[PDB]
Design a protein around this ligand. Structure first.
Ligand SMILES: NC(=O)C1=CN([C@@H]2O[C@H](COP(=O)(O)OP(=O)(O)OC[C@H]3O[C@@H](n4cnc5c(N)ncnc54)[C@H](OP(=O)(O)O)[C@@H]3O)[C@@H](O)[C@H]2O)C=CC1
Ligand SMILES: NC(=O)C1=CN([C@@H]2O[C@H](COP(=O)(O)OP(=O)(O)OC[C@H]3O[C@@H](n4cnc5c(N)ncnc54)[C@H](OP(=O)(O)O)[C@@H]3O)[C@@H](O)[C@H]2O)C=CC1
Ligand SMILES: NC(=O)C1=CN([C@@H]2O[C@H](COP(=O)(O)OP(=O)(O)OC[C@H]3O[C@@H](n4cnc5c(N)ncnc54)[C@H](OP(=O)(O)O)[C@@H]3O)[C@@H](O)[C@H]2O)C=CC1
Ligand SMILES: NC(=O)C1=CN([C@@H]2O[C@H](COP(=O)(O)OP(=O)(O)OC[C@H]3O[C@@H](n4cnc5c(N)ncnc54)[C@H](OP(=O)(O)O)[C@@H]3O)[C@@H](O)[C@H]2O)C=CC1
Ligand SMILES: O=C(O)C(=O)Cc1ccc(O)cc1
Ligand SMILES: O=C(O)C(=O)Cc1ccc(O)cc1
Lengths: 238, 238, 264, 264
């Protein structure tokens, strides 16, 4: 399937590893130029080397940035604009009795992470994409988590409604269980066997499997799709 | 229907007018003692006089408080505890290209309004209600608005799950169009005719109509209901 | 709370036992005259007797009727009209799909056709029947007793879940139409409520998985955040409220009544 | 993107025109062999000819069949098996309920029974039929073409919405069962997509409200945030992706493809 992505410029946040990284791969495969970023500069360099060597015809800008900080995010965007003159795709992918436990500071702190992180990065790409009349934004979306994720889901709806007139489409993807660094991490922090028993597919998803969907949403082929959140979860949501 | 509310202590935020006020009325009618609050002290005194005179057998504590400020909210709760020794009910009711328009400050500011406002007031009543083994919390729940409301809806789900074991039930109610001060306000800021045409009931709801539901959720009769958000909207959500 | 129900005429289908029976009790207690029904005569008489003796101040009409059959359902409504001249409240409550098989390919057309000709058409038909009556008087309440499988379908409930989703959508569409006539249509999704059908459901899934009802119950309970199975009285409360004058601005919605089951 | 579809055998129901036809084109283009069908012979031949000439490298089998009838649907699958020995992809696509009447009380049992015996049982039956086939080979994709009325029901769509909600629930339940067999079941809800049925829908609602199709279209458009009606190609893209090896971790979901209609 021709996805019409040749020479599109894709900013993928959190692309030094896991889902972010595979997405970057898959976009370069469709012929995108990339902006990959992350805060670990060494992790990112590795990502960068691997990418450049697999995709020698594609431009790849690497920028060390924390997309939870305002200044870094503005510079990320301005640096990408300086480099390519356009940004066509944004994949927002950054990190997310008990309840009565959580202070005001604890709540404000998670709002100023990924919540405000995705909103701000969106705000920042919107004028560029509207100018181009071409845009794709894919948000990669557990009490604190669920509140932010619900907020993001509705943010997606409302922003899609507004920018659809400019062919700037915005959607979200909900991972179930995906074999990423954090996950081989946060089950060595056999237990896996108990998760498999909860996934109707009896199997954990690959980052490749996850990326396939994001790339399709980021393509020309998805031109009539906007405002939706799609679970990618091996059937967990059944 | 006997709602089992005799001598229950109900904190109703925003009860100097509109929905908040009618809820307070309806709770006193079922035999609750009240804590009513608001920032307009004069509006609140009027509410208070009207209440006291309609319900002379019921205790009514009035406290001037902004339930969007941390300090006011802690004092509101501690003042109510000092007065009655318990708080049985909490009704959280406080006030809620364009998008790329909104700054980080603009977003953080609305998070620190009603979003954090309901979460904090909940956190603050939870230990009291758990101790009593009896609790009812009803959250009265448009881009900024919709994001906070989505966040609150999911917050409701998660907190209900956690405190259900203590018979502290928490639910939410979504108003459609209700004839409140703000609404006779924000359609004189005939236009009404265009809203009626959107409400399948061809009529705007009364605060009485709205309160009936909240009071039922706040009652003993609702002992098996928790974690849900109910629209009260004359059929708008059809 | 005054529900404004004194002398309303209420038809509760499947009211000889379980959820429907307790709803009828509670509507009687608010001052309604009832029409109650069931398929088994002896059960129904037992329910009628208990109601008549507990609420002798209220008229109660009991009719043997299968509200999955058109004839009986048409007759039910006419007999209710001949007696009372009006019907103010309908509670659609009747048996949903059986618990025998859930493996999908193994279900034939016939098994689906029956499903659809049961509770599904049952509630729609009875709704079509009471609508003109409620409309002409501009007062009407219909409460569909559905099931949470309609929202979140379960392994033992493929058929049931399909029926329930459908009825949840029907609810919205009809509420939209009748709204301007003060005829309000809502639905309630019981989670797990202690009735004969639930106890029968326990009995047999134990036998089938080679365990006891008790351990089945224990399992269910671990999934309910309130850690208990609801009572028919707890469930009737909400149904009675929705059937009331107090619910006058609520239409088109389906509410889970489930001890938090939906929040888990 | 390589979709991994080379030599998959795909059955697209209702493929002589509109959404189904464009899906078939697009599956052919990815390297699938097709089974296409319809009720009208002359239309079908026209579709077959166009496909055969456009994609002569691919086997195409065309059969006249009403996939609302059990006989024809059973025969369809056997004829498909006799030809290819396997079926890898099913796209459930057939006519839903008529646009004539939406006022509810005015719909009889028979009108509902037909509804339920149409697209509703049609998709369920055909699903039951292809399931063992896909299961034995551990590869299967089924994509149900439903409708947004299933999520958000509309005044001109009471019946349709009821059917669609039901099918959306069916989707979840069957996906859960077949998931471990790498047989994936999803659904797509078209918003407004420019087909013969949509143009026919325009024609007649104009006539009925005493306006022109153009002004009906203008009205629809004002409600679509993209301010345009979708193309069958735009819609086929997503269906083809879901039928693909690339969609290997997606099951049990229904996706709106609607130019933002759901976000409004
Ligand atoms: N994995 C899963 O199954 C699930 C994932 N999600 C969500 O999907 C997204 C992907 O997670 P996953 O791949 O598992 O996580 P990983 O931690 O495995 O990968 C995260 C990647 O993003 C980078 N990153 C993280 N934070 C920032 C930041 N603030 N600024 C710039 N780069 C950042 C990391 O590099 P560095 O640390 O160097 O910046 C790394 O490359 C997350 O938002 C997560 O919340 C949600 C539910 C389940
Ligand atoms: N009315 C409607 O149709 C809709 C309402 N809602 C929500 O329902 C709730 C009720 O709104 P409604 O009655 O219309 O609003 P009104 O402004 O009519 O009434 C609000 C009441 O709450 C008080 N109040 C407001 N803010 C605070 C605060 N920060 N601290 C303490 N008291 C406060 C007000 O008094 P004072 O100003 O003196 O504090 C007043 O008594 C709101 O949260 C609103 O967002 C949502 C959608 C529609
Ligand atoms: N109990 C629960 O936890 C749940 C209940 N539900 C739903 O709630 C409703 C009530 O269930 P429940 O109270 O548990 O069931 P019970 O079997 O315990 O009670 C059912 C009552 O309805 C009568 N009845 C059943 N079908 C018909 C019919 N076609 N015509 C007339 N009367 C009928 C029965 O009498 P007779 O057999 O003699 O007619 C009996 O009086 C059902 O729709 C069920 O699907 C859904 C999910 C969970
Ligand atoms: N177009 C839209 O915007 C929307 C479409 N949908 C749904 O999407 C699907 C496709 O609709 P659309 O492409 O617009 O319809 P069209 O009528 O334009 O195309 C339908 C095709 O399917 C065939 N067909 C219809 N019913 C049957 C049957 N029982 N057996 C075999 N073939 C059949 C028709 O041929 P013949 O008549 O000769 O059999 C024709 O080839 C339908 O399920 C519809 O309900 C839902 C909402 C909106
Ligand atoms: O799934 C639902 O909610 C149902 O409608 C079916 C049902 C009926 C009775 C029970 O005891 C359990 C399940
Ligand atoms: O409501 C839906 O989504 C449907 O399934 C019915 C439908 C079918 C074709 C149309 O052109 C419009 C509506």
């Amino acid at each position: 399937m021709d996805l019409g992505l040749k020479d599109k410029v894709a900013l993928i946040t959190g692309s030094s590893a896991g889902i972010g990284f595979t997405i970057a791969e898959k976009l370069a495969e469709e012929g995108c130029h990339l902006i990959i970023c992350g805060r670990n500069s060494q992790r990112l360099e590795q990502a960068y080397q691997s990418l450049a060597q697999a995709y020698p015809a594609q431009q790849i800008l690497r920028l060390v940035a924390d997309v939870h900080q305002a200044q870094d995010s503005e510079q990320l965007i301005q640096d990408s604009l300086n480099q390519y003159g356009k940004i066509d795709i944004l994949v927002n992918n950054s990190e997310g009795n008990l309840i009565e436990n959580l202070s005001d500071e604890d709540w404000l702190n998670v709002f100023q992470g990924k919540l405000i992180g995705y909103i701000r990065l969106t705000n920042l790409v919107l004028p560029i994409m509207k100018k181009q009349h071409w845009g794709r934004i894919v948000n990669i979306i557990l009490v604190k988590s669920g509140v932010v994720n619900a907020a993001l889901m509705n943010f997606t709806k409302s922003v899609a409604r507004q920018t659809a007139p400019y062919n700037v489409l915005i959607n979200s993807v909900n991972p179930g269980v995906i074999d990423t660094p954090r996950h081989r991490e946060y089950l060595e922090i056999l237990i896996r066997e108990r998760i498999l028993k909860t996934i109707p597919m009896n199997r954990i998803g690959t980052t490749e499997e996850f990326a396939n969907l994001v790339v399709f949403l980021a393509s020309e082929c998805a031109s009539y799709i906007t405002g939706i959140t799609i679970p990618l979860d091996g059937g967990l949501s059944s």
